[PDB]
Design a protein around this ligand. Structure first.
Ligand code: 4IP
Ligand code: 4IP
Lengths: 288, 288
């Protein structure tokens, strides 16, 4: 039985079933129809987001994107190991969902795939907890499931004809400099009309952080920091990056550091639109 | 001005700039995480591949290999003359990219280095076309570039501490018997843990052909021909050697002949694992 430590992490099922719908899908362009302030530069974005989809959720997302549209990149922002069991999204969870904190991206991927390969070799996976059970620390009350499939996200993304690109952000935290560099380079290295579907585990903090970064890179020279944050918070699930006191109070320092990073990334973005040509890491060494 | 004939071939710049990233890098071992069929014998391969890198792409490849690991051999599969101008990959292109078709390997190398030596002696190289310009036959719209450096691939491979080994395969075609012999001998003449980075011009047909040959030599006695081809097609760029009708229809005969060769190479590989001890050329004389 698991106990939520990194030595005995828990298998947590995120999808209620393999048919569960997407509940935090949204498109950034819709901000232009709801936000009452500066909407300059919004309505052209080719940008959607969600929480981790079930197997069937990937169908709904692919359909939503087809209706609004070119190349599609699914942007997985999750550092932690995750995948699918019988079409249900699953995560390998240690306290605060930081199983891969401090690891190189290569090691994060290796540890996830060694885990999925291990599950895939079993006829029955034991100890599968729901999110309520994990929160309630009912570690021994998990279900035993006959394995039909064990898959990584790539399996479902590739099936839709989309590309997959992973940015290894720790849950509840700001991206590290390597991952900021990676996101800026990804955007620059692909056509302006590329569609990006951004997702995290819950489709809240990491997803909305990256949405704001996209916005800043295009518009920081024409829209104030406050209005970028506020307009990103204007569409469901109304995630406001200004808020640093959330349901889990012990995470406040990471929400504070995340907003502080966004302050600095805004200045980088603004200066980049005014002539600066280096990377985020280079700018940060000189300016922070 | 060039006209794409062998008498007046074109200088075509393959890298957008000297900083352009690698877009078709992949490692064969990753098949074990994506392919839903027989993955026997895959996850141990020390094998990566790509298209022709820019100067900066060689950095990214060297870093990727270091993270996954011993001796490293860069396997250049390109018969045609190619090199670098100011860190951008360049090719000397006649119709279908067959400038060196029918030449001995020694002559191919001599013609390439006489060409690079010629460019290196100039202060300005004229007529440098992009791939779009060449496709559009805009032979006179090429750019004139001040020469900072002119280098062959060896310059960048040696800089990384890697070995360089060339297999002279014509674009869009199967390897000739001498080059099959050379590849089998190279693999046999180096330790099992040798890392190979295989590349062609586009990182598609020739690269994936050689990947499949590596796979067959190790696993043809335990994996069906169909599953070897299918599993090699399971990772980006999803190059499927079974497909014989591609974007350029006039090349279909060469894609057909390439698949036919792979059928025969599979039987050679299988018999070799069951006792046969001769070379490909010897086997082919007796069995085809
Ligand atoms: O998917 P579940 O298991 O529900 O967990 C979610 C994810 O961790 C969210 O982050 P992300 O979307 O990046 O994966 C997190 O957002 P933040 O911690 O950044 O706020 C949510 O915290 P709450 O905001 O308290 O709901 C948390 O409930
Ligand atoms: O690098 P560029 O200039 O883009 O040209 C590429 C190379 O010729 C590819 O072969 P290789 O990787 O061996 O160099 C070829 O693969 P095949 O002809 O074998 O299929 C591609 O054809 P397409 O598959 O049609 O894209 C072609 O577009």
């Amino acid at each position: 039985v698991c106990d939520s430590t990194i030595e005995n992490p828990c298998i947590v099922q995120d999808s209620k079933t393999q048919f569960s719908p997407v509940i935090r899908y949204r498109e950034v362009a819709s901000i232009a129809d709801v936000y009452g302030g500066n909407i300059t530069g919004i309505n052209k974005f080719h940008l959607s987001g969600s929480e981790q989809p079930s197997e069937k959720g990937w169908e709904a997302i692919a359909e939503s994107i087809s209706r609004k549209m070119k190349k599609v990149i699914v942007l997985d922002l999750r550092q932690e190991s995750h995948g699918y069991l019988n079409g249900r999204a699953i995560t390998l969870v240690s306290v605060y969902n930081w199983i891969n904190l401090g690891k190189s991206n290569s090691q994060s991927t290796l540890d996830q795939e060694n885990w999925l390969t291990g599950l895939r070799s079993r006829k029955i996976v034991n100890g599968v907890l729901t999110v309520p059970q994990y929160v309630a620390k009912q570690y021994s009350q998990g279900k035993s499931m006959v394995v039909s499939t064990v898959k990584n996200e790539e399996y479902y993304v590739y099936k839709k004809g989309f590309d997959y690109y992973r940015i290894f952000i720790s849950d509840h935290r700001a991206p590290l400099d390597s991952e900021v560099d990676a996101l800026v380079a990804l955007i620059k290295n692909n056509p302006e009309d590329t569609w990006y579907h951004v997702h995290s585990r819950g489709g809240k903090g990491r997803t909305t952080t990256v949405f704001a970064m996209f916005d800043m890179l295009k518009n920081a020279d024409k829209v104030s920091f406050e209005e970028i944050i506020a307009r990103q918070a204007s569409i469901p699930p109304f995630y406001n990056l200004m808020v640093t006191n959330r349901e889990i109070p012990e995470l406040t320092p990471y929400y504070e550091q995340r907003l502080q990073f966004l302050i600095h990334f805004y200045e980088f973005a603004r200066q980049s639109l005014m002539g600066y040509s280096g990377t985020w890491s280079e700018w940060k060494k000189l300016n922070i």
